[PDB]
Symmetry: C3
Subunit: 223 residues, 3 copies
Amino acid sequence: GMNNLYHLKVRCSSLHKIIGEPKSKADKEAGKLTDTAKSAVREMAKFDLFGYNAFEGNKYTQKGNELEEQAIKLSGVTRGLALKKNTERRENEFITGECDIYVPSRKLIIDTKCSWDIGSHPFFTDEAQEKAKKAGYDIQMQGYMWLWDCDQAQIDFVLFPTPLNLISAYDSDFKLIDLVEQIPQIRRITTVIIQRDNELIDKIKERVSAAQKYYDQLISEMS
Amino acid sequence: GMNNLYHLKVRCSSLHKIIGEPKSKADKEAGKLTDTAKSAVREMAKFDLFGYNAFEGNKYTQKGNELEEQAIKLSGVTRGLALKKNTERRENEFITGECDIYVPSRKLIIDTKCSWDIGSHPFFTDEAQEKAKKAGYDIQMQGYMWLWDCDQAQIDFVLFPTPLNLISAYDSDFKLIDLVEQIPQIRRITTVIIQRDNELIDKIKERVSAAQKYYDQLISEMS
Amino acid sequence: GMNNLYHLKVRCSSLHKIIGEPKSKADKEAGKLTDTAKSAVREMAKFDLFGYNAFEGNKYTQKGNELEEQAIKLSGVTRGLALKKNTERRENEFITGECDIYVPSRKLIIDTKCSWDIGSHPFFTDEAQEKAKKAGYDIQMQGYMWLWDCDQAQIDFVLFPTPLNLISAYDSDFKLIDLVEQIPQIRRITTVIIQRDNELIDKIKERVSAAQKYYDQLISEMS
Ligand SMILES: [Cl-]
Ligand SMILES: [Cl-]
Ligand SMILES: [Cl-]
Ligand SMILES: [Cl-]
Ligand SMILES: [Cl-]
Ligand SMILES: [Cl-]
Ligand code: NA
Ligand code: NA
Ligand code: NA
């Protein structure tokens, strides 16, 4: 009963953690979760039950927060559009999300990803595509397109110099600032276009639904 | 000849390192060691030859040492039994072990595992089972049951607050103490029951015997 | 056009990064690069385009630099030869290399590898062979034998005490110096002999050639 006050909605940014499918196609269709997915759902259960946050956040994520405004401005000038940070979190019965930029005029979501350094930044188009696949940003965009009724998403990978306050004793000013400022700004944005894929949105639904059932079972053990 | 003063007995806590079997069933039956097993046996050889200890020990293992008495008391009250720390190391021709608790009245070994934090602690029954499998504690218990002539083992995963002296500059008091003290103690013990499995004990024998032959070969190279 | 001032030659020490072959034999023969190889070539492209050095160097590599002379002396006394550090970097159309020791009298390259500690040092012959395979030193030697017209290479893995200036606050004087000085020096050199393999040299050619084409494509995206 207490456990009807616990209910899982998966953040769009965490959907890649639970989206994976069993290698067995019959188990995929039966809605069995992968070991990775279960491990992620346990972290979500332990956060909601105990307040323990597995991923605190660090200099990488703090850089994106500090440069968020600058990223959105670059997204805008690259497209000749006056863009603003979206400030609403939406949700449906499965997921919740707060996108960076919503452009209703083009049925378009834009998301800015502020790379840490030249090494991690995907300058090259194959590199950007893979990074979006490996990091799960493709699935994240499908979640935003679902919540915002959009037809496309564009992930703007952007490299700015690292703000001084985030460069630790062991980090390099030369690498994280000087070398970056030498590169023309137009070469430091790489965009990956993701088309809405309703079969993928249906997959998000199936996987999240299986995750919520597993989550409920976890909650019941602690009740 | 000098090398007849080197002889491998594998600690119960390290048996998981050498227990793995080749994917090839014919090689398993021929007693071939896996690459993992060989790598572990080299560490054992280099410790006995050179005094170099690969695994020093750290805040995680120090927590278990500091809270060992408290763990055993919780193991006892959970069962209505007055339990004491076992203080003998036993050995046979293959392995050596010192269990935490021996209950001859029930042909039972108990082992306490003091989790570091909420994240690493297996609250959930599937989680505890997997942790015992992944960490090799199931095989460790088979080794103690062999040495102590017991029919069952119970692994008590227990979460206590982290002692202040073990919380580094970068660790969280809030997470490692405050959040833990909010959780009822009865929800911070999860027990996994392992039945004695004589086929597994025979596997320990085979694998350790192959390890000892490999070890002897390593010793001979340095002689 | 600017991009005709960018040209990839792979260092012998990095050849293992790009030498891997697709699991598909038809793709291997078509000259397709593995994902690992592509990832390495991107790091090379970003270094030449932006000056960003992915691998800076650390206490492990600094130890080898400091003890380079001592290593070469041990290589020499082990063989009864007066050896000197080779000081030329050679190159051909594919690779560049600077070997440690060239012995034209024996059509022989020697390379010294200064292990960090007892744990990482390959005392055992199987261990040394695997380390040379895992680290890619076998392929590195094929590259030097190609550049220096030699028939064989010998990799001398050598363990000396770690110089004091490289032992960090958290490192052990006892382990990195005292325990090492107790071991006879003749037990702290393990040599692996690599025969010239012209089929492997042809493989280096094919793989580097595919890498250079991929590299050129990366350069063109940034031009
Ligand atoms: Cl989100
Ligand atoms: Cl990044
Ligand atoms: Cl033990
Ligand atoms: Cl733990
Ligand atoms: Cl080189
Ligand atoms: Cl090393
Ligand atoms: Na973003
Ligand atoms: Na224990
Ligand atoms: Na060398």
